[PDB]
Design a protein around this nucleic acid. Structure first.
Ligand SMILES: Nc1ncnc2c1ncn2[C@@H]1O[C@H](COP(=O)(O)OP(=O)(O)OP(=O)(O)O)[C@@H](O)[C@H]1O
Length: 529
RNA sequence: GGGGUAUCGCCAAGCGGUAAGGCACCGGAUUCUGAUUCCGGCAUUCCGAGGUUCGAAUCCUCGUACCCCAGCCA
């Protein structure tokens, strides 16, 4: 339970409400991100918990920043997380004629006027954070005059910025938001829903409260920056004929260590091609997380974990990463692949190669078993062999034995070096009556596989607070490798996390994999210690 | 000037009766993944100073710190 639910409980009990109706309202100007997921889980979660409704409403009030691509991707991610909205998808643009009708009521009551101060001037008259503002010389036009000027606006008679509609509140109010907040501005831009029907568009504050009222939203939940704004919310609803008055409650937004959430910024990474696109696996976007191999259930857990408070905060990746590991550890069928490979032959081995039965899950027999080809000329990961080591090192030293995964206890004997002091191959003896551990892959039966080792995108924890977040990108956010994996991975499906034993949970990258050359994104590493 | 917030390294319960939980972390026991699983340890102390009370993280003063607002963006 959190503060928002205690409020809802009181509301139900006191008989203030009988049903709860929330909404998630993203603007379609970018893909959704892990931050949005916190709001989604909150809004849609309360609905199903209290057997209530939650609308998906696209706040599409600014046509020059939104695109249809986003509305489709947004609907996509919402479902993927496992949530369904109430009834049909809604749009603020759905209320354009209603909004305009309400602007007129405001005008008719003298609570709004068409101002003509330029954009620079409007800023000047607004005062500062310590100095009150001042009434525009156009502030006292007659209702009749305002009706005329507004229709001129509506009818495209004014250039952009040459006139706008404003609420007539208080230029000296300590709330900067109540100093005659603009209600309509001219934009001769094709809207993705209403095409060119409109050339004057409503501002967020005017649109949002009226839309919540019309939809019968019982609790408008959004982030902390809107606490001041709440005053305008109520002011609008108090001066127009509407029969309900939704209440807004604010909770703090999610900040994740090492990542930027600002869609402006995420947009820069994409536009400047510093990442593949919105769903690149290093992005904090829901679709990127998906491609990265996270699971809708792991994200819901994350939300469940971070809580909901008024407290500003920054979660460490350790918490996110914890969630996906827990999920995958339980449901991921284990398999084997070698990322950095150095050849290892067993001379002692006689035969064209046998077959070893390995479990799909070392702790869950229920998940079945499989037939993995063993051999003499195998593949091993470089860092597993040590020509020289100490008691700690529990892998393959040039003097002792090491158990192969689910196979034979081999024994290191004779190395062979590459001219440049490197190791070309390892020769070891095997003990036919054997069946630390190390993973392997029969050279003869090995499947060529690309591996994409992903790390955090930024090299500082709050790249946001940097003078130039771009200059603080991690150059090792993605490190590609060519390795080998057992042939069963021949049947991996896009997004189906496997646990490459002793490395990390990996998943087939849709975007890149092909027939011969599959591509595996490393979702998250294993607890290395 | 206004609106907000202050509990462990990072989250977070608490709502006058004596500091939950989770992530990280340190042990130790199993383990053919240095994984998983188990065991145990991690706030006499709740931004600071005063005060009320039998008892205060919780009430009341008085400070201090941080966040948000001056888009015809949301
Ligand atoms: N980081 C966040 N943490 C929690 N909730 C968020 C976060 N960012 C946005 N939201 C919520 O998502 C809802 C939709 O956000 P919307 O896409 O309209 O704008 P925004 O993401 O705040 O701004 P921007 O488009 O500049 O990123 C908002 O009502 C807000 O409460």
């Amino acid at each position: 339970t959190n503060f928002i639910r205690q409020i809802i409980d009181e509301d139900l009990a006191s008989g203030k409400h009988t049903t709860v109706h929330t909404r998630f309202p993203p603007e379609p100007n970018g893909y959704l991100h892990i931050g949005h997921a916190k709001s989604i889980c909150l809004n849609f979660g309360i609905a199903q918990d209290y057997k209530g409704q939650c609308n998906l409403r696209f706040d599409d009030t600014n046509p020059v920043k939104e695109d249809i691509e986003y509305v489709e991707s947004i609907k996509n991610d919402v479902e993927w997380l496992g949530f369904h909205w109430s009834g049909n998808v809604r749009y603020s643009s759905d209320y354009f004629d209603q909004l305009h009708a309400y602007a007129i009521e405001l005008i008719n009551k003298g609570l709004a006027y068409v101002d003509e101060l330029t954009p620079e001037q409007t800023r000047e008259y607004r005062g500062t954070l310590t100095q009150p503002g001042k009434n525009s010389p156009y502030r006292d036009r007659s209702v009749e005059e305002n009706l005329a000027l507004f229709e001129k606006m509506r009818a495209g008679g004014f250039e952009e910025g040459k006139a706008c509609l404003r609420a007539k509140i208080d230029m000296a109010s300590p709330f900067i938001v109540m100093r005659d907040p603009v209600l309509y501005r001219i934009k001769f831009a094709e809207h993705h829903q209403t095409g060119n029907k409109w050339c004057i568009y409503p501002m967020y504050d005017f649109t949002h409260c009226i839309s919540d009222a019309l939809e019968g939203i019982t609790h408008s939940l959004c982030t902390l920056e809107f606490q001041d704004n709440r005053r305008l919310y109520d002011w609008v609803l108090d001066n127009i004929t509407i029969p309900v008055h939704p209440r807004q409650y604010e909770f703090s937004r999610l900040n994740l260590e090492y990542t930027v959430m600002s869609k402006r910024k995420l947009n820069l990474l994409v536009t400047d091609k510093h990442v593949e696109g919105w769903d690149d696996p290093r992005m904090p976007t829901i679709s990127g997380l998906r491609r990265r191999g996270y699971t809708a259930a792991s994200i819901r857990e994350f939300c469940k974990r971070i809580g909901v408070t008024k407290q500003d905060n920054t979660i460490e990746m350790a918490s996110l990463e914890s969630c996906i590991r827990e999920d995958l550890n339980e449901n991921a069928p284990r398999a084997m692949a070698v990322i950095d490979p150095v050849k290892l032959v067993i001379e002692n081995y006689q035969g064209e190669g046998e077959m070893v039965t390995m479990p799909n899950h070392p702790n869950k027999p229920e998940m079945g078993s499989r037939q993995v080809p063993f051999s003499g000329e195998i593949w091993i990961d470089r860092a597993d062999f040590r020509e020289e080591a100490n008691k700690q090192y529990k892998r393959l030293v040039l003097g002792k034995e090491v158990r192969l995964r689910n196979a034979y206890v081999i024994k290191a004997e004779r190395v062979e070096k590459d001219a440049e002091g490197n190791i070309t191959t390892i020769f070891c003896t095997y003990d036919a009556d054997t069946l630390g551990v190390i993973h392997w892959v029969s050279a003869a039966h090995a499947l060529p596989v690309e591996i994409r080792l992903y790390d955090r995108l930024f090299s500082v924890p709050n790249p946001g607070a940097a003078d130039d977040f771009l200059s603080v990108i991690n150059p090792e956010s993605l490190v590609i490798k060519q390795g080998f994996a057992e042939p069963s991975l021949k049947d991996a499906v896009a997004g189906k996390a496997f646990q490459f034993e002793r490395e990390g949970y990996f998943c087939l990258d849709s975007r890149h994999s092909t027939a011969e050359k599959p591509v595996f994104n490393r979702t998250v590493g294993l607890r290395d210690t």
